[PDB]
Every structure is written in C-alpha cells, then in structure tokens.
C-alpha cells in the first residue's frame, strides 16, 4: 500500500466510545499510540461518565487492527493499512452466551497524523445478575484469533472469532464476534486471502489513577499463511 507508508513509525491514537447497555448510557475515551513495525499498541481508557456499567474486558475488542504486523510474505493481505488514510467502518455484533449482545459501529481513519477510532455501542437484553451487568469477570484477557476473509456481499472484509472471558471463581463467559469492515474511500484497497490475526492483551491499572480505567498493552501478528 501507500497506506502502509503511514505506519512506518509510532502513530498516536485517540479512541472515543458512546455506549448504552440496557438503557444505561456511558462513555469511554482512550489515548495512546501504536507501532505496526512492532505489532504493538498501548492505550489508556477512562470511563468519562463515572463507573463503567459492564466489565472492562468485554469492551477490549471494540475499543485499531491497523497496528497488526503482517510479515513480508503477507503484506499483500493487509486490508486495514491499505484503506488508510480515508479509513473504514468496522461493524460488529457480539453475542454473549446465555446473556445479551453488543452491536457496534466504528469509523477508523486518520485525522491529520492521529489515528482515530470513533465508536457507538449499543447493548441489549443483558441479565441484571449475569456475568456482565453483575461484574463477575476477571480483569484480564485471553488470546484472540481473528479469522479474516474477503466479504463477497459488501465492499471489504469480514471476520469471525470467539473470545473467552474468565469468570470470577471459575469457568468462562463466551463472546461470539461477527465483524465487517468496509472502506470509506472510493479508492482501491487490498483484498486479502484468508488468514488470521493473533492478538495478545495485557490489562493493568495506573496506580495514580482514581477514575474507573483500563491500561491496555496489545501485541498483534498476522499468520495463517505459510512463508513464501
Ligand atoms: Cl476454572
């Protein structure tokens, strides 16, 4: 890409989320930076409406796959950078097993030299004493492997993956993700062969921060195609 030229160094990131779960409105802002040459990004998120009504880990996938590192033999398969700077709309539906669902729509694009992820999330039908509204999930994140394929119905790509959220005192809460990304521009974008993004996340807290928050470190690598 010429889009890939925009990712040769550290890129600042701004994330904004307007959320609503079972009618309860909330907002999140995140700031940080990503470096695709290191397949790494770091973000700190604050709940800018007080206390978060769902567990932080359930929002990780919603809250910039542009920073995945594609190896040389897979560069032709990086849709995300190819769509830049005009960007793409990412839509997901996330189904929490035996509980409610999130519907998300985000625009990801450069605004000047900052990458911006602007999100609206709406969650419906959650159980008041379920794992989500009840805050019964551990503060951590398991590895996710996002399987990407060309979308033959709309312009761009689709993906499917399931996230396992550890539940306090044992067991898991599954979150089944459906994803579509559609370029914003009219310009040509790369159409990838099937592959996946392997994503590892470490969640932490800022010892000096009294607001409800999440510090995220994330490593993301493309794979699923043997070298050559
Ligand atoms: Cl267990």
Curated annotation (Swiss-Prot):
Subunit comment: Monomer.
Modification comment: Contains a chromophore consisting of modified amino acid residues. Maturation of the chromophore requires nothing other than molecular oxygen.
Variant or mutagenesis effect after changing residue 75 to R: In Topaz; shifts the major emission and exitation peak up to 20 nm
One Pfam family, short name: GFP
UniProt record similarity statement: Belongs to the GFP family.
Keyword Cell division: no
Species per Swiss-Prot/TrEMBL record: Aequorea victoria (Water jellyfish)
SUPFAM superfamilies named among the record's database cross-references: GFP-like
Function: Energy-transfer acceptor. Its role is to transduce the blue chemiluminescence of the protein aequorin into green fluorescent light by energy transfer. Fluoresces in vivo upon receiving energy from the Ca(2+)-activated photoprotein aequorin.
Keywords for the protein's UniProt record, in alphabetical order: Chromophore, Luminescence, Photoprotein
Single Gene Ontology BP annotation: generation of precursor metabolites and energy
Gene that encodes the chain: GFP
Protein name, entry field: Green fluorescent protein
Signal peptide: none
Phenotype for residue 172 to A: In mut2.1; shifts fluorescence lifetime from 3.03 to 2.50 ns
Tissue expression as described in the entry: Photocytes.
Biotechnological applications: Green fluorescent protein has been engineered to produce a vast number of variously colored mutants, fusion proteins, and biosensors. Further generation of mutants led to more stable proteins (at 37 degrees Celsius for example) with brighter fluorescence and longer fluorescence lifetimes.
Keyword RNA-binding: no
Top-level taxon of the source organism: Eukaryota
Phenotype upon changing residue 163 to T: In P11; increases fluorescence at 475 nm excitation and at warmer temperatures such as 37 degrees Celsius. In Esmerald; leads to brighter fluorescence. In VisGreen; leads to brighter fluorescence
């Amino acid at each position: 890409s010429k889009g890939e030229e925009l990712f040769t160094g550290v890129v600042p990131i701004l994330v904004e989320m307007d959320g609503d779960v079972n009618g309860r409105k909330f907002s999140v802002r995140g700031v940080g930076e990503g470096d695709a040459t290191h397949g790494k990004l770091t973000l700190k998120f604050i709940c800018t409406s007080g206390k978060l009504p769902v567990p932080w880990p359930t929002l990780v996938t919603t809250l910039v796959q542009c920073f995945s590192r594609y190896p040389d033999h897979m560069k032709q398969h990086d849709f995300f950078k190819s769509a830049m700077p005009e960007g793409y709309v990412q839509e997901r539906t996330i189904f929490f097993k035996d509980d409610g669902s999130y519907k998300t729509r985000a625009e990801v694009k450069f605004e000047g030299d900052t990458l911006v992820n602007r999100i609206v999330l709406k969650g419906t039908d959650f159980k008041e004493d379920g794992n989500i509204l009840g805050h019964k999930l551990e503060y951590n994140m398991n590895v996710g492997n996002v399987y990407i394929t060309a979308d033959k119905q709309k312009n761009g790509i689709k993906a499917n993956f399931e996230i396992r959220h550890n539940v306090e005192d044992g067991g898991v809460q599954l979150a089944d993700h459906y994803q579509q990304n559609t370029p914003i521009g009219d310009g040509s974008v790369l159409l990838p062969d099937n592959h996946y993004l392997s994503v590892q996340v470490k969640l932490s807290k800022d010892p000096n921060e009294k607001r409800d928050h999440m510090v995220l470190l994330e490593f993301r690598t493309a794979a699923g195609i043997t070298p050559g």
